Design a protein around this ligand. Structure first.
Ligand SMILES: CCCCCCCCCCCCCCCCCC(=O)OC[C@H](COP(=O)([O-])OCC[N+](C)(C)C)OC(=O)CCCCCCCCCCCCCCCCC
Ligand SMILES: CCCCCCCCCCCCCCCCCC(=O)OC[C@H](COP(=O)([O-])OCC[N+](C)(C)C)OC(=O)CCCCCCCCCCCCCCCCC
Ligand SMILES: CCCCCCCCCCCCCCCCCC(=O)OC[C@H](COP(=O)([O-])OCC[N+](C)(C)C)OC(=O)CCCCCCCCCCCCCCCCC
Ligand SMILES: CCCCCCCCCCCCCCCCCC(=O)OC[C@H](COP(=O)([O-])OCC[N+](C)(C)C)OC(=O)CCCCCCCCCCCCCCCCC
Ligand SMILES: CCCCCCCCCCCCCCCCCC(=O)OC[C@H](COP(=O)(O)OCCN)OC(=O)CCCCCCCCCCCCCCCCC
Ligand SMILES: CCCCCCCCCCCCCCCCCC(=O)OC[C@H](COP(=O)(O)OCCN)OC(=O)CCCCCCCCCCCCCCCCC
Ligand SMILES: CCCCCCCCCCCCCCCCCC(=O)OC[C@H](COP(=O)(O)OCCN)OC(=O)CCCCCCCCCCCCCCCCC
Ligand SMILES: CCCCCCCCCCCCCCCCCC(=O)OC[C@H](COP(=O)(O)OCCN)OC(=O)CCCCCCCCCCCCCCCCC
Ligand SMILES: C[C@H](CCC(=O)O)[C@H]1CC[C@H]2[C@@H]3[C@H](O)C[C@@H]4C[C@H](O)CC[C@]4(C)[C@H]3C[C@H](O)[C@]12C
Ligand code: SF4
Ligand code: SF4
Ligand code: SF4
Lengths: 318, 107, 176, 388, 70, 165, 97, 158
């Protein structure tokens, strides 16, 4: 019954990533005064299937890889970690109920930079690596503020249990008391996943080749599935963290509906933002963190440690 | 067991999917190709120093992680001072780099 | 007469400084940019449903070439070679002779449609409206050889498209 | 010379300007040397023009700056007319200003939107090519071709405006300022866009003139120079408009100048629609301009002139002229030499993009690699005219 | 029109709703109609193991009440 | 053929080598990846391989040459090689280490029962048959046109093989 | 209120196409389910419609025959199946069918 | 149920063909003017993406190369390089007179007289430039050309 419950989490994730690609192309289209996919299946509902079948029958590129082992680890590591990040999410009950769910998710996402680093080193092209190194410095940079911001929030929740975040926001969303942190959190999840205006990997491809340049259609398609899995998961986490739905233990499915709608609307705000702004230059997205977000994140971390004490509002430990 | 069975599946499913993707398409015989094709990697200090700065900041964060559990202590004045002291140290480390030509990757 | 595109001096009162501070910290202009994109999402797309719907053209449109006839059925072309002389791309090759009834008619009329620039100088230069550019723009081929038109092809295009070509000439001949 | 990065835009992206091979030396993120290699769209156009009559050579000028089709035609026509010593009639001069300003709008939409598209701002590109698509219909209704009209010819224009065109142009112009405003709601005050353009590729006024720059590249640095105002050529002395002038010489001022030129073009188009006079469209002189198809089929003299005009062509008196116009990209000029026959002896094309691109190395000094993309975009380079 | 994007968002929504719905239902099925017991701390584990011996069938979700007090 | 069309030119080449051949590409791939050479007494086989272009040239000149009609030809390379040494030489070019010592299936059998039987058959010498010399073609050495063939297999100072007189 | 009225139009399209079977055929053949006046039909089977309240470019369209010159064109249709008489009207070169 | 091998191969062939034509990611050499009309095929009015044809594709994920402008002799080696790097199945669309056969520089010393001298071409789109609609007709002709492929059906009878 648990093996089933795992496949009731893995398979639906892959299908959501499949149909996020349709939703992305159609939302971008209508913001650009066009229709987007609407020919392959009714309203483009078969576009993801055609793209999927097309890529896996495509002739593979020539690996020409320096390290065969690290060539195959990178996609396996990326895909496996992306699926693993979903096991502690309370929707409203987690698949695995962890007492340190927040650290488990924070710790697991820190390993996601190995896929970037390995594939770049295994690519066998010198400009591919400098692409991977530039991306890694961006990923680990915006992890810093995510950890500190997450630390600040958990000082009003009182635990690392992800299901305790629901109880904290039973009376009111944490978006009110922590909107300065929700702003910098939301951006850092854009930069964490390498999304516009932070998708320097795709934008500067000609200047510096991206790390995923060497993989064939099938293997490259897997790198891409892991990347939207993270984007959906980081907005599900954004919803639980700052827009906590109320849980009625007799009607759990009502939580799952209201919860799901909030996850989509943030996930479609990623698409909304992609269609609205130009890209950052690399030294500018490093300036934004080390010289804007980090000073404010540290000041608000100091504030959110002092505030519970001076208002007598320290949350329970249990 | 459940965490182990969850992980083992997630990486077994990823492994099969990648193994199928890499090898199974090789059974399609798309003709055969011709021949595809000095410099080195110029080490950059800016890309190194950003990695190190993350390493040092990331460690100072490890000391901040227990803070949620640390506010349950009777001795709150001691906890509050040492909490602000560590976060302020994280600020002084940032200020030193900022004011001493350190955030060179930021330029 | 000139204007200054960017010669403003920002005001240095506290009210204005706070306005820029609020803008810098609260991302005001960035939200405004998000508003414009949101408005377009609820505007109607400009897409048309090709091939069921087509983009608007005019009578003067310059498309595929065709050789025309008189109402009786005799070919309008008299082999004057004015089109061959004017053709900027040298896309037209003409040979002529006296026909069995002594008429001045071509024996070879060819257009290398891959040389042609679809400028319509040849129809401007023809004295008898024999060569025209038709309204057809959907005649892409799979092989290069299918785009080297001989006389038969252009005569067949004239027979195929005369109904439309004549109406387009009727609509524009007064401007010409 | 930490490393030399030979950047070929051979695998071209959705820019369409052409293909540029750029050879650079990157001492880290910074650029120390930039070396454009520009033979990839060299088609021998100037030599081919020597084997064509003056009329046959005109379509070559559509295909130089292939986003300024009717402005390139006007430059050729103004040069040939000057050697012929003839004058186009007043109605055609208004049509040539009217479509000269519709072409300026066409060029700046491509210039600003593809500049922004390269710097990641994709959406305004789609917003504005719905407008360019409506402008392409004006081109097709007067000439029959969406792009390479071949419409502006020595002596005037090929045909008259079809009935109902001016109303449709007025309807387009009435709604168009709002379209520009939407574009500025996404770029003018956007901090990300400003960070990518402000104080990038600065050019001093003194270095601009010596390097041969023209157009926005001068006016961004504060030089008060516009050929339409100082050396007017059609009816531009009879239309009121202002020249936008920059103050800092950076990309952002050049971006602002172009956006303000689009507004002044709509201002001019408004005056052309109201002041359009009646009359004929080509010089009433059949040894230069072909006669009407009705007269050619009725009059012996008209048939003779028709026959000769489309075979030999009109002969141009011997002489050499340098004619330049304020093209959207800059000063577009042709040095045209006539040996007295009906085919030009030499036709040298002065492309504004040729000098601007040569000035890239100067502008790129001390900038990051990602800035070079912004510098090339603000120059508005199309390789049809760079190479010819 | 814009509402033609909804079918894609609806399929995506149905996909992100199954994980939460299936986990809740499967928990009820395996645990006798109640929520799965949560034991983060050792005391909560001690009580769950106590209930396991109490029931007599070796299931910790089988509650025994006053009827067994005799 | 020699009965149906008596005036026919019958051309008998040896193993032909080239970029898309299945002779040297066979020794570089099948022997190397996933396997160690299946050479069956490689010291007993002598091979005389001919370059593709020389065969192509020979065929053309047989069209343009009017004496070729009715004649059978033998196209053979400049040199005779020992099948063992040949495989060794191939490996040196491909920079794959050589250590002296796959089922047929649908799709496209790569390595087969009969292919081995042929790679081991010894290149017959039939002196009376005319060869490339009689058609104006000079047989090209293996050494020149073997780096061309095998530069692809090479990952990311080479000595020739020894001929058999 | 307007939302209900909008939905009424959506249902009217299903009946306007002859029922669910008729409404689905156009959906998969033409990827569009608008309904408009039948301006005419031509000798090969194509049907021509206009709706002048649409914007310029969509106010006219054709539903291609399912067979033409002995070729099954239920799925495979192309813009060259419009005959010259209607080609002028469909491309708005004229104003009269 | 009962089914022959011939029937199975015909249906699988229809599946892969439907996927390959439904998801055509084009690489575009925007060599000259014709690239401007390629850009109009992506703009709102025609919107090639609604057919499943992505606006921008990398050379090594592309399915079709669209040659939109004049191919000069200096540029020809680079175009063949890109063509070889493209993974199969690969198709070339020749757009406009210049690429089709040289066009109005056909008699130039610096121009390749047609891109079929360099790479194999599947569809030729006439015009100078072809209208955005004329290019769209060409792409839809490539989809029908792909629909008629019989790779599996041939393989069975080999
Ligand atoms: C995996 C998800 C697949 C779900 C969609 C069903 C896919 C199978 C469709 C099929 O086999 O028939 C296609 C058929 C093939 O047509 P056909 O080959 O039977 O042709 C017959 C046409 N008539 C009867 C008119 C002569 O085409 C369709 O009707 C499309 C059906 C798919 C619609 C699914 C959309 C909702 C999802
Ligand atoms: C990869 C993840 C490995 C397991 C991570 C376990 C975790 O962090 O969660 C703690 C989790 C969560 O901890 P918790 O404190 O939140 O809750 C534990 C349960 N209670 C509270 C009731 C006590 O702890 C466990 O669930 C224990 C799982 C058993 C330990 C498994 C040991 C073997 C794991 C494999 C080792 C790594 C394999 C090689 C990896 C290669 C290099 C990356
Ligand atoms: C067989 C399963 C093996 C595993 C495959 C991979 C995983 C499972 C994915 C299944 C794919 C499901 C989508 C099928 C798409 C059906 C095509 C379609 O949408 O119809 C619209 C299309 C529309 O035709 P069109 O493409 O020409 O449309 C032109 C555009 N208009 C109409 C607007 C002008 O209908 C067809 O033409 C049919 C295409 C062939 C479909 C072949 C697939 C059907 C399934 C056969 C399986 C055979 C197994 C052996 C028995
Ligand atoms: C990981 C899952 C991802 C999602 C699903 C991925 C898509 C899966 C659905 C698609 C499967 C399609 C398989 C065919 C692959 C493409 C084939 C092709 O393109 O043709 C090239 C080749 C054509 O062969 P070929 O030899 O002519 O091609 C080479 C031509 N020369 C020699 C000139 C170079 O097709 C194949 O090789 C087919 C392989 C076998 C396919 C299975 C057939 C089994 C059914 C028949 C037996 C029935 C007996 C009873
Ligand atoms: C405004 C949203 C609204 O209508 O109220 C939210 C409503 C109540 O929230 P509830 O989950 O019951 O708990 C609140 C305190 N715990 O709960 C709901 O209405 C259910 C969720 C539907 C509303 C989603 C709002 C998401 C807003 C964030 C996305 C922003 C999208 C771009 C704007
Ligand atoms: C009341 C507060 C008043 C404001 C305090 C002074 C603000 C800084 C003054 C200053 O000098 O600013 C200019 C300069 C900015 O440097 P910069 O612009 O990056 O130079 C490169 C150009 N792009 O500044 C600098 O270069 C140095 C600025 C370093 C600041 C780093 C501080 C990081 C920590 C954030 C604060 C956290 C709280 C610290 C502990 C406070 C305890 C009370
Ligand atoms: C009583 C005591 C209580 C304690 C608090 C009291 C004081 C509170 C008032 C202070 C509020 C702090 C504001 C926190 C937000 C972060 C501010 C910030 O970092 O903005 C500055 C940053 C760069 O600034 P810049 O424009 O480059 O200026 C030049 C550099 N000096 O600009 C940027 O961030 C650029 C970001 C670019 C990417 C933006 C793309 C997305 C924009 C739309 C998202 C809208 C917000 C989403 C919210 C999600 C919520 C779930
Ligand atoms: C999405 C819907 C967007 C609404 C349309 C855009 C809009 O109304 O914003 C304009 C408003 C004014 O901004 P502005 O023009 O720069 O002038 C302000 C003077 N300081 O700008 C604003 O006032 C928006 C401010 C939003 C508050 C900051 C965002 C906080 C995010 C966490 C919630
Ligand atoms: C990999 C995935 C198939 C996996 C699956 O559904 O199981 C397929 C389905 C749709 C595809 C996407 C879209 O079809 C097209 C997108 C547009 C750009 O070309 C980038 C790739 C792009 C973002 C594609 C990435 C990937 O190949 C996708 C996501
Ligand atoms: S349209 Fe122009 S290029 Fe084409 S055949 Fe006529 S005159 Fe020649
Ligand atoms: S088509 Fe016209 S111009 Fe050309 S040869 Fe015939 S009659 Fe003369
Ligand atoms: S075919 Fe015509 S439009 Fe296309 S590049 Fe050549 S000249 Fe320009």
């Amino acid at each position: 019954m648990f093996m089933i419950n795992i496949l009731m989490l893995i398979i639906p994730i892959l299908l959501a990533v499949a149909f996020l690609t349709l939703v992305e192309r159609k939302v971008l289209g209508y913001m650009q005064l066009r229709k987007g996919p609407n020919v392959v299946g009714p309203y483009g509902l078969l576009q993801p299937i055609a793209d999927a079948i097309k890529l896996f029958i495509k002739e593979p590129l020539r690996p020409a890889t320096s390290s065969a082992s690290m060539f195959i680890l990178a996609p396996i590591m990326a895909l496996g970690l992306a699926l693993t990040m979903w096991i502690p999410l309370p929707m409203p009950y987690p698949l695995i109920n962890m007492n340190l769910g927040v650290l488990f998710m924070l710790a697991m996402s820190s390993l996601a930079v190995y896929s970037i680093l390995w594939s770049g080193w295994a690519s066998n092209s010198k400009y591919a690596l400098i692409g991977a190194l530039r991306a890694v410095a961006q990923t680990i940079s915006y992890e810093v503020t995510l950890a500190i911001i997450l630390l600040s929030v958990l000082l009003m929740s009182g635990s690392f249990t992800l299901s305790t975040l629901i109880t904290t926001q039973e009376q009111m969303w944490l978006i009110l008391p922590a909107w300065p942190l929700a702003m910098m959190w939301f951006i850092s999840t854009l930069a964490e996943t390498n999304r516009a205006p932070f998708d320097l990997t795709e934008g500067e491809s000609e200047l510096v080749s991206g790390f995923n340049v060497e993989y064939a259609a099938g293997p490259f398609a897997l790198f891409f599935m892991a990347e939207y899995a993270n984007i959906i998961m980081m907005n599900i986490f954004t919803a639980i963290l700052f827009l906590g739905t109320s849980h009625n233990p007799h009607m759990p499915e009502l939580y799952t509906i209201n919860f799901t709608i909030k996850s989509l609307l943030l996930t479609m705000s990623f698409l909304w933002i992609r269609a609205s702004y130009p890209r950052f230059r690399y030294d500018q997205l490093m300036h934004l963190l080390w010289k804007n977000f980090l000073p404010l994140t540290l000041a608000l971390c100091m504030w959110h440690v002092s505030l519970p004490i001076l208002t007598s509002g320290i949350p329970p430990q249990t | 067991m459940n965490l182990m069975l969850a992980l083992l599946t997630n990486f077994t499913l990823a492994t099969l999917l990648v193994i199928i993707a890499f090898w199974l398409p090789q059974l399609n015989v798309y003709s055969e190709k011709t021949s595809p094709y000095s410099a080195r990697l110029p080490f950059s200090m800016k890309f190194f120093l950003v990695a190190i700065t993350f390493l040092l900041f990331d460690l100072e964060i490890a000391l901040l992680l227990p803070l949620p559990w640390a506010s349950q202590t009777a001795n709150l004045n001691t906890m509050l001072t040492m909490a602000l002291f560590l976060i302020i140290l994280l600020a002084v480390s940032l200020a030193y780099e900022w004011t001493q030509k350190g955030l060179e990757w930021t330029e | 007469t000139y204007k200054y595109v960017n010669l403003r001096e920002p005001s240095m009162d506290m009210k204005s400084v706070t306005d820029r501070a609020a803008q810098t910290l609260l991302w005001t202009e960035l939200i405004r940019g998000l508003g414009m994109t949101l408005s377009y999402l609820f505007r109607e797309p400009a897409t048309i449903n090709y091939p069921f719907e087509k983009g608007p053209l005019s009578p003067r449109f310059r498309g595929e070439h065709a050789l025309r006839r008189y109402p009786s059925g005799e070919e309008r072309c008299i082999a004057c070679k004015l089109c061959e002389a004017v053709c900027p791309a040298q896309a037209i090759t003409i040979e002529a002779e006296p026909r069995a009834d002594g008429s001045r008619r071509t024996t070879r009329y060819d257009i290398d449609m891959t040389k042609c620039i679809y400028c319509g100088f040849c129809q401007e230069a023809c004295p008898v409206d024999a060569i025209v550019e038709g309204p057809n723009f959907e005649f892409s081929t799979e092989t290069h050889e299918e785009l080297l038109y001989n006389k038969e092809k252009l005569l067949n295009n004239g027979d195929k498209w005369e109904a439309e070509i004549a109406a387009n000439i009727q609509a524009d001949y007064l401007y010409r | 010379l930490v490393s030399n990065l030979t950047l070929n835009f051979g695998p071209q992206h959705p820019a369409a300007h052409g293909v540029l091979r750029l050879v650079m030396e990157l001492s880290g993120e910074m650029v120390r040397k930039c070396d454009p290699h520009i033979g990839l769209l060299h088609r021998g156009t100037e030599k081919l023009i020597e084997y064509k009559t003056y009329l046959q050579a005109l379509p070559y000028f559509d295909r130089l700056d292939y986003v300024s089709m009717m402005c390139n035609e006007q430059a050729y026509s103004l040069a040939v007319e000057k050697l012929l010593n003839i004058r186009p009639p007043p109605r055609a001069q208004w049509i040539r200003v009217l479509f000269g300003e519709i072409t300026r709008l066409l060029n700046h939409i491509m210039a600003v939107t593809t500049h922004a598209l390269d710097i990641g701002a994709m959406t305004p590109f789609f917003w504005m090519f719905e407008e360019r698509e409506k402008m392409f219909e004006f081109y097709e209704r007067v000439s029959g071709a969406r792009m390479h009209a071949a419409y502006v010819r020595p002596g005037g224009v090929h045909q008259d405006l079809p009935l109902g065109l001016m109303d449709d142009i007025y309807e387009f112009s009435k709604n168009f300022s709002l379209r520009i405003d939407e574009l500025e709601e996404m770029l003018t005050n956007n901090r990300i866009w400003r960070n990518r353009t402000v104080d990038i590729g600065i050019v001093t006024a003194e270095d601009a003139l010596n390097y041969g720059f023209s157009g926005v590249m001068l006016r961004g640095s504060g030089i008060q120079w516009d050929l339409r105002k100082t050396q007017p050529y059609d009816v531009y002395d009879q239309v009121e408009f202002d020249v936008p002038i920059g103050s800092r010489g950076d990309c952002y001022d050049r971006y602002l100048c172009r956006v303000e030129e689009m507004r002044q073009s709509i201002r001019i188009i408004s005056q052309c629609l109201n002041k359009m006079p009646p009359g004929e469209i080509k010089v009433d002189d059949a040894k230069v301009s072909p006669p009407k198809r009705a007269e050619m089929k009725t009059s012996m003299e008209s048939l003779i002139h028709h026959f000769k005009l489309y075979t030999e062509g009109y002969q141009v008196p011997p002489g050499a002229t340098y004619t330049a116009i304020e093209a959207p990209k800059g000063e577009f000029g042709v040095y045209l030499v006539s040996d007295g026959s009906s085919r030009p002896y030499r036709c040298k094309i002065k492309a504004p993009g040729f000098a601007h691109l040569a000035g890239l190395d100067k502008m790129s000094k001390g900038h990051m690699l990602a800035d070079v993309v912004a510098i090339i975009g603000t120059q508005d380079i199309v390789f049809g005219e760079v190479d010819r | 029109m814009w509402f033609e994007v909804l079918p894609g968002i609806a399929v995506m929504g149905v996909c992100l709703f199954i994980p939460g719905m299936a986990t809740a239902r499967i928990h009820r099925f395996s645990n006798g109609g109640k929520e799965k017991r949560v034991a983060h701390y050792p005391y909560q584990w001690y009580l769950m193991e106590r209930d396991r011996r109490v029931s007599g069938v070796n299931r910790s979700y089988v509650s025994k009440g006053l009827e067994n007090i005799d | 053929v020699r009965e149906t069309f008596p005036e026919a030119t019958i051309i008998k080449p040896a193993e032909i080598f080239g970029r898309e051949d299945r002779f040297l590409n066979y020794f570089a791939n099948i022997r190397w990846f996933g396997g160690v050479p299946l050479i069956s007494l490689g010291k007993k086989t002598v091979k005389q391989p001919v370059y593709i272009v020389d065969v192509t040239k020979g065929i053309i000149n047989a069209i343009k040459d009017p004496d070729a009609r009715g004649k059978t030809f033998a196209f053979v390379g400049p040199s005779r090689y020992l099948l063992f040494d040949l495989v060794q030489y191939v490996f040196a070019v491909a920079h794959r280490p050589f250590l002296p010592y796959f089922e047929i299936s649908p799709f496209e059998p790569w390595t087969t029962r009969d292919k081995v039987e042929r790679i081991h058959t010894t290149d017959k010498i039939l002196p009376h048959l005319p060869g490339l010399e009689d058609l104006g073609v000079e047989a090209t050495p293996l050494e020149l046109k073997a780096i061309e063939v095998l530069r692809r297999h090479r990952t990311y100072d080479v000595q020739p093989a020894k001929t058999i007189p | 209120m307007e939302l209900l009225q909008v939905l009424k139009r959506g249902l009217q399209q299903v009946s306007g196409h002859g029922g669910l079977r008729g409404y689905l055929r156009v959906l998969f053949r033409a990827n569009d389910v608008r309904v408009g006046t039948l301006v005419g039909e031509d000798k090969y089977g194509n049907k021509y419609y206009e709706d002048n309240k649409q914007f310029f470019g969509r106010h006219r369209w054709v539903i291609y025959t399912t067979e033409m010159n002995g070729k099954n064109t239920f799925w495979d249709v192309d813009g060259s199946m419009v005959p010259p008489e209607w080609h002028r009207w469909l491309h708005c070169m004229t104003d009269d069918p | 149920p009962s089914s022959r091998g011939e029937y199975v191969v015909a249906k699988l062939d229809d599946l892969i063909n439907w996927a390959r034509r439904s998801s055509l990611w084009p690489m575009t050499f925007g060599l000259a003017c014709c690239a401007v009309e390629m850009m109009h095929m992506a703009a709102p009015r025609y919107d090639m993406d609604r057919f499943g044809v992505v606006f921008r594709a990398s050379p090594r994920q592309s399915d079709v190369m669209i040659v939109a402008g004049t191919l000069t002799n200096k540029m020809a080696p680079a175009l063949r390089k890109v063509y070889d790097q493209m993974p199969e199945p690969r198709y070339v669309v020749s757009m406009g007179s210049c690429a089709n056969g040289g066009g109005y520089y056909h008699y130039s010393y610096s121009v390749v007289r047609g891109c079929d001298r360099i790479v194999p071409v599947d569809i030729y789109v006439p015009g100078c430039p072809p209208t955005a609609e004329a290019l769209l007709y060409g792409i839809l002709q490539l989809q029908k050309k792909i629909k008629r492929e019989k790779r599996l059906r041939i393989w069975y009878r080999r």
